[PDB]
Amino acid sequence: FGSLKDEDRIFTNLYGRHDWRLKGALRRGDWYKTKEILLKGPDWILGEMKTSGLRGRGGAGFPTGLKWSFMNKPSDGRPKYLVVNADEGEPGTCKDREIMRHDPHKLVEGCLVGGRAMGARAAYIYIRGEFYNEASNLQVAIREAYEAGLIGKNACGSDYDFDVFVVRGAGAYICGEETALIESIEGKQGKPRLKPPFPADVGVFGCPTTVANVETVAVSPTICRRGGTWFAGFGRERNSGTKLFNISGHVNHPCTVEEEMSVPLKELIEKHAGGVTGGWDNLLAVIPGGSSTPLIPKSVCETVLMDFDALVQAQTGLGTAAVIVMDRSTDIVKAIARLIEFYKHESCGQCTPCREGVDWMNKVMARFVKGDARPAEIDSLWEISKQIEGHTICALGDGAAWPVQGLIRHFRPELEDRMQRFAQQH
Amino acid sequence: FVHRDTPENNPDTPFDFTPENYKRIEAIVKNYPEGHQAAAVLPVLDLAQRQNGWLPISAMNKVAEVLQVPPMRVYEVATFYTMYNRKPVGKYHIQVCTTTPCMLRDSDSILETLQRKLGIKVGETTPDKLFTLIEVECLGACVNAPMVQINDNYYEDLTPKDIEEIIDELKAGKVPKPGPRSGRFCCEPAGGLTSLTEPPKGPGFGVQAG
């Protein structure tokens, strides 16, 4: 439904307004039951995650509990590890920039709460290098915490020993990928690996590893504190909890606000954030989960709401839940065209289908904006799109195909007219 | 992506970490597991850039030696990521975000403003080498859509004029109040908090027993 209470919200420091430093955090009481929780043991913590129903919170929303659980298997003499990706690259995502900058601590105890759940020896946080200032904030926060003894040996009074590190990203969206974050951490080129050697099995430095969206790590301590039920109650069925929503582009007050997941879309922009610029009638389309997810046109939108189950019914992905809105004042053919330009300037090129395919769609898309290309080419790009969708080594090729598929699926008449417009003036 | 040796950009340019920098390099190596120094390539290479913006081929070679990694590896990392200059770069090095979110909120205007403000075209640098204009991609901070990254700072939610003001500040004086130069605080609802209006909660609240 929606309308989460501020009291039941998780990052009270969102929008700042409270010292992102420890003191403000102590008034927040973020480090309240940390020793106790870890004392409970890895299993109990992971269990709470399952009860929570917390899905990914990052890109694909895999059940968090089960995922983390995959490394709750006995150590084989290799130190297990925690990797917390804070790349936050998906266009439209400033979701994570908040927790890191505004509430660094929540993530610090998220790390150790999560750490004992997987029995990780240590956690490395890969904040995108672009955010240099952001990094300045977290290690100040990390430094505070150890000074306190909250982390490190004798973590918060626990025999558990966990060390948290921050790693510099270098302006790559793909670094974000789970197998590629690792390789950047490993120091090689940021190129994803194949899934058959799964991340838990082969870890960073060949030591079991797990990767979580920073939001996913951050909520785990509060969910254990509030209990899985409290959390699981807010969401709809499988889709559960309240996910932060970042609305950017063609909305009166673009902002990131956390609301009950499964909140109706027509409502999200209506209640928080602000009204669609030019009236709700001025809504050509919206991309619910960021650039990777397909945009949904206005008639479908209010009907549907923001939860992953509802969106997959709608053929779109909740993803990072970044709402980008396009008024009737925008050349979508060019809007999506720059996202394909966003992906040609960024895919690693390791795999044949993404390398040439994304460049091929970029060339066709640029011609489509001009209208130089003939109408028959439009379904040609359909077929190029699915060749890339199922054949890619990672998901980015998955992601490049979806916006192209959305433009053809709902805005096929407009592209034909741009086709027609150029043919007429000759 | 080919380094054709040039008198300026080639190893004749000797590179070596200042004593202090080497100390920093050591810590960086400590974070990673022992026996995995190679993992510190990115961090160390960055430090080199901090030392010299150009990050010449010589620098890349030094990084390799310092981390005992094959020279090619350093090259791969440098030529793969984008935050590494691999050429001389402007003192200010402004970068304008032009992904759809920003563009939808009129990013193009900002770029145009800069082009003539700077007098230099994108992909190029000012004669004094004070400013280098680059059309970079999503830099995060999308909510404050109109946004650009001057050097390390993130100037956000900027209207065309604001930048001119900022650029002037950069041109005469320094530290031009880096950050979103609009009333909105960070990424709050511009008009008024849609939530988080009430005071934050307290320790232990609604906590399940133990």
Binding site: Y132, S136, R143, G152, K153, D163 | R24, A27, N31
Partner: peptide
Amino acid sequence: DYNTYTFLDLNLDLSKFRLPQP
């Protein structure tokens, strides 16, 4: 306001806290 070495130098300061290596 932060310096170019804030991240690295701060980290070095944290080195002492950093738990022993693997």
